[PDB]
Design a protein around this ligand. Structure first.
Ligand SMILES: [Mg+2]
Ligand SMILES: [Mg+2]
Ligand code: NA
Ligand code: NA
Lengths: 95, 95
DNA sequence: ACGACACGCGAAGCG
DNA sequence: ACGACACGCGAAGCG
């Protein structure tokens, strides 16, 4: 059977966010971070027409702790860094 | 508090698929389709290193019925078209 | 392709 | 930046 197609409504869905090393440190390259990606909630889906787009109406900042290794003459220095994620909490179709 | 960052594992998540008018009809432009987008399941997330990527291991074809209006001298002709969606069912990190 | 339907909403039906 | 840990797995601890 072929079921009726259902519109993907404008709402929050779980997406994959890649953790930016550049925001962790823009002035040094000598480091590794873990994990490289986390889940975030994001507004996606399609509105009625192309005069409007699916956009967040409230966003929530969420700090997470990442693992950082600084490499100094081939030796690891273990540190922690805090990345502030942005979660979409609600969406609307917006002009 | 800043919770520990958790890796976004390579697995299936719900994504938004935009319905291609071109696959519905490549030889005529005189038509509209509804809905413009549907949910599908897709492999996403991050593997251990950049020598591997998150890829589907089994995919399931899923036909859905879309609404089509053919416009002929400004009058609508109501038709149905069948679009075959591809859902990801499982994923692995692959080299 | 230039924002039918007694209306408004969504070869529709309801109130 | 050139694939520590008695090992293998993941300034680790377990078996
Ligand atoms: Mg009537
Ligand atoms: Mg020991
Ligand atoms: Na009507
Ligand atoms: Na050890």
């Amino acid at each position: 059977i072929a079921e009726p197609a259902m519109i993907a409504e404008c709402k929050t869905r779980t997406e994959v966010f890649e953790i930016s090393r550049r925001l962790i440190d823009r002035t040094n390259a000598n480091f590794l971070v873990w994990p490289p990606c986390v889940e975030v909630q994001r507004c996606s889906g399609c509105c009625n027409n192309r005069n409007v787009q699916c956009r967040p109406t409230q966003v929530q900042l969420r700090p997470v702790q990442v693992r950082k290794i600084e490499i100094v003459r081939k030796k690891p220095i273990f540190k922690k860094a805090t990345v502030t994620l942005e979660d979409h909490l609600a969406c609307k179709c917006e002009t």
